[PDB]
Symmetry: C3
Subunit: 186 residues, 3 copies
């Protein structure tokens, strides 16, 4: 059956995301609608390019990057997002429904909770911080900062900024999972 | 909506909470019922009075404060709570249903999991800890400690204690969001 | 919709000796994701009172839940089967469940051990606090489907790095989620 309460990337490892080069990563993102809140589960695997293997010995200034999901007024993912549109859809089993969705407003971050930009200092409640671990190692933390509706050129957005303090020496950027939630638009 | 699965403060910024003076803050709290667990999402904006701008040079020992939600046997908010009664109801759209609810036991913290204070041994599982960030700045952590059913003068309670260890100088007390869950009474 | 240990404090888990602990675990199915809430009370034995001045090398322990093709708990799990069932009130359904595959950790998200690249996404880390004291953290590492001799697994490793002196191992609560098998 069509799982109309889940919007996801599918849980496979095929690259679906472009951070620095085309399809250099798998963002695994599952949004499950529990009424007024979306329960969100996220991880990242970088498979190629600039962020695949971190070396802060050779490149000490490379300490963060950003993955943006931008949505229009109907909750449809915009082309300029880092996440590709071909496997972002409602769930069917371990895959997606066949028809590209036309409406997902119920999965969008609430605009009264998280107003869009701006020319307006905004309240911090539109941010959630967490920590994930590279390679599952407990001494390899990175910060995942999630921000709602702070991108311009869209109606809604979810942004993930990944950052770290440690001087990583050939560490592959693939992460443990993090769960959060946010208030839904409808 | 008439969303009988969500009890909330609404997502607006109208001050609804009294910490040190009348309506000096907006507590944004959303309780969403996923069967036997309540999914909770919380943030705080202090808009005026003593806790609005922290200055620990002027006030070295102001390092914490508490917001309490106290409930009767039917799950109805009691007026000694810091959150105002007019701001707390079942969801309708971005607003509240027009008349106060009579029962919300399904939203109350489970008394077997989290007993009221008594002569019996108190267990730590009635607490959840998280860290939120003032102004969304990653060097401005504060701890949110949430405690279930540990107030007297009520049948159920949810208490939020906000505290910090750093010496903050002119830092605005408005927070990022935190998600947690707890076991429901019914 | 809810698989759980019941929320009472009667011991149901064997870490170092028979029924030395109460694992309170609640798994609620929100569709494609399981919402999980976990805490631990150790009541007796080696892990009840931590004293790292006396015993410097007692710094971690593991609790394993092993499941077969049907989502049924295998009896070599640390958690006892008598206690683990679908909710009815504050107790359990009268009969033992035959099926809960919809509560199992998804095997494409979280594959069993293999001879291919092993990804970290099958781990969730959190911190809980012993005695509810903010200066007594311990790490709770949760891992999906990485045990052998089972179809599915959930494992909780508890560890700490501070030198605790006479600290009772009873934790605050931690919530996490994971992608469901179906
Ligand atoms: C409830 C609660 O929160 N309790 C905490 C209490 C409590 O606040 C007080 O007791 C009051 O009640 O405090 C604990 O800490 C006591 C204080 N303490 C002692 C130490 C040793 N060092 C020192 C240190 C300090 N800094 C400051 C920079 O840090 C921040 C900041 O700017 O303030 C913290 C922010 O949260 C962070 N922001 C974000 C968004 O993340 C920022 C940010 O990153 C930067 O600003 C950049 O923008 O930074 N730095 N050092 C702290 C310390 C401890 N270690 C041990 C080794 O570290 C790790 C590791 O990397 O290996 C961390 C890792 O996450 C962890 N892994 C896991 C899975 O948990 C591992 C692991 O435990 C071991 O490796 C074993 O495998 O350890 N290094 N440096 N710091 N603070 C307390 O009382 O114990 C903590 C308690 O939770
Ligand atoms: Cl009022
Ligand atoms: Mg909705
Ligand atoms: Mg102490
Ligand atoms: Mg299912
Ligand atoms: Zn790689
Ligand atoms: Zn297009
Ligand atoms: Zn290491
Ligand atoms: Zn302000
Ligand atoms: Zn001001
Ligand atoms: Zn600063
Ligand atoms: Zn004890």
């Amino acid at each position: 059956k069509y799982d109309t309460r889940t919007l996801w990337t599918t849980p496979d490892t095929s690259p679906n995301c472009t951070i620095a080069q085309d399809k250099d990563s798998k963002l695994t993102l599952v949004l499950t609608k529990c009424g007024s809140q979306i329960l969100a589960n996220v991880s990242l695997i970088v498979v190629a390019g600039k962020y695949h293997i971190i070396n802060n010995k050779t490149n000490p200034k490379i300490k963060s990057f950003t993955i943006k999901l931008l949505f229009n007024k109907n909750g449809v993912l915009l082309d300029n997002s880092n996440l590709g549109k071909a496997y972002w859809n409602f769930r069917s089993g371990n895959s997606n429904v066949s028809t590209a969705y036309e409406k997902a407003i119920g999965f969008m971050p609430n605009l009264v909770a998280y107003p869009k930009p701006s020319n307006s200092k905004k309240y911090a409640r539109d941010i959630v911080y967490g920590t994930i671990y590279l390679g599952g190692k407990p001494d390899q933390p990175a910060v995942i900062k999630t921000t709602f509706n702070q991108e311009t050129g869209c109606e809604y957005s979810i942004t993930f900024n990944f950052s770290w303090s440690k001087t990583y020496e050939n560490v592959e950027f693939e992460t443990t999972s993090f769960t959060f939630s946010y208030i839904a638009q409808e």
